[PDB]
């Protein structure tokens with residue numbers, strides 16, 4: 001079965017690490033952190049890895065039940081919630097995944113809305129509530145691999161114990177010094193001092209002059225100063241496509257061309273690696289300034305020795 | 312002729328095309344009295360997007376624009392006038408042949424979400440940000456997205472900035488009480504109440520007796536009050552994306568599809584997938600379709616409109 005990519009322009013793609021549209025392509029060659037995100041991880045022959053799942057609505061989402069309000073040193077009112085799989089089935093900690101699929105894969109204060117629809121009814125319809133909430137993924141109480149996490153609210157009382165609870169992610173609460181936003185630092189999925197397991201592997205350029213190419217989205221902020229971004233290796237639609245197709249990878253590296261369909265011209269070429277990430281021959285950091293109607297077209301299978309035309 | 316195909320996605324791998332929600336169940340309601348003419352999740356089988364349908368899951372019931380004015384409510388809350396652009400940031404051209412900016416909500420109700428802002432201008436050199444819960448009443452006379460402006464209301468009384476880039480992230484509904492006017496099949500008046508909506512995707516209905524529409528149903532969160540509201544779409548967003556990609560020619564007015572259990576390989580039921588992008592089944596009851604979670608629709612063959620479906 002021939003390998004293919006979807007024909008979706010940048011303006012028709014979404015981020016696989018947060019529910020955002022792709023805003024720009026981006027490079028950062030001098031990045032010192034190990035790039036090992038766990039969402040938006042899929043091999044070219046369609047094997048989902050890390051915490052990656054298929055739903056755009058599942059990325060950085062949680063489902064579960066609030067248990068109780070809990071004490072925390074930090075500002076706000078805090079709540080423990082058990083978490084299930086996104087499909088409602090119990091999360092089995094013995095499954096070979098880092099955490100429930102969809103779990104956030106970076107350190108930070110994730111801002112969103114907690115909503116509840118009660119199990120018990122009264123015209124035999126249940127009571128509901130929703131409030132803004134923050135999940136600090138760096139907190140010692142962030143233990144999704146153990147089946148429970150903690151969130152904080154501004155609301156002090158109107159969160160119900162033992163009721164079905166949904167977290168809808170919206171952005172970040174803050175990127176100030178004490179908010180520990182670092183998109184390449186993984187949460188400790190089982191808690192402080194524990195080793196993460198079953199991780200999707202780190203990615204890096206191997207060839208001289210090459211750097212990773214990211215699909216970048218700017219992420220909203222609840223408050224404060226900043227213009228934070230989330231970089232994914234492949235957009236969610238590519239994850240969905242590769243998973244569907246399951247085309248055998250005929251080498252370790254696919255040559256792809258970024259094409260302008262209006263002119264038919266190649267703007268640049270890139271290596272699409274077997275494990276599901278892109279590299280380009282670029283010697284600068286920052287956005288790739290190109291029209292959003294551009295898209296990657298699969299050209300051919302090459303190998304690690306192939307030399308990319310400089311961007 | 313390029314062969315017609317559907318994605319192989321189970322219900323648990325599909326999302327709603329009319330609100331950012333996972334698909335929870337398949338659903339029928341044969342005695343529905345309303346005209347079904349939703350505008351999101353509309354796509355012909357040969358890949359033509361219709362109504363206000365666009366491809367991004369993040370675009371469904373989303374808005375982008377700038378706040379222009381603060382207006383206090385008489386009783387409670389603050390209202391904010393917002394000019395809206397296309398979701399890609401370009402100016403919305405009201406003369407374009409669409410009902411409203413793509414992504415605009417396609418139903419009457421109080422849509423609950425978060426308005427966020429990231430300022431354009433900066434002596435620190437990082438822009439200021441804010442976000443607050445917000446409600447958009449799509450039935451309101453001030454909901455005129457085809458004219459390029461809407462209004463949202465907040466509990467927050469002051470901290471929303473004018474002239475700054477503004478994003479609406481939908482989350483659910485504010486209420487489904489009587490005075491919240493939730494009706495998933497009542498279209499907003501995109502240009503205001505005395506004006507006719509234009510460029511609409513056509514209404515959908517079964518043509519043959521004994522058939523009813525089959526919906527992909529999602530339950531939508533509530534900010535408060537009692538209720539278990541649901542949003543039914545004609546096709547999931549992944550189907551829209553797939554059909555748009557493939558643009559396979561339609562070889563008849565109807566694609567026969569089978570809902571299959573891959574574990575047994577057995578067909579659970581069959582359905583007509585109509586040219587205009589919707590499903591009908593031979594079922595004479597309302598409610599969820601009880602079917603295994605591993606199930607998915609498989610394209611069988613092109614048939615004729617006169618094809619008689621096996622009763623469910």
Ligand SMILES: C[C@@H]1O[C@H](O)[C@@H](O)[C@H](O)[C@@H]1O
Pocket residue numbers: 132154155443444467
């Ligand atoms: C619920 C809380 O209401 C307060 O007035 C706000 O200042 C906070 O941002 C938060 O939204």
Ligand SMILES: C[C@@H]1O[C@H](O)[C@@H](O)[C@H](O)[C@@H]1O
Pocket residue numbers: 222223224225439440441470
């Ligand atoms: C930078 C400041 O952050 C705060 O949280 C906001 O409430 C202000 O409007 C401002 O944007």
Ligand SMILES: C[C@@H]1O[C@H](O)[C@@H](O)[C@H](O)[C@@H]1O
Pocket residue numbers: 131155444466467
């Ligand atoms: C921002 C407002 O804060 C209040 O305390 C809440 O009761 C309202 O639901 C709303 O969220």
Ligand SMILES: C[C@@H]1O[C@H](O)[C@@H](O)[C@H](O)[C@@H]1O
Pocket residue numbers: 127128129158534535536537
């Ligand atoms: C029915 C009631 O609606 C209100 O909005 C909520 O604040 C309460 O918790 C309760 O669910």
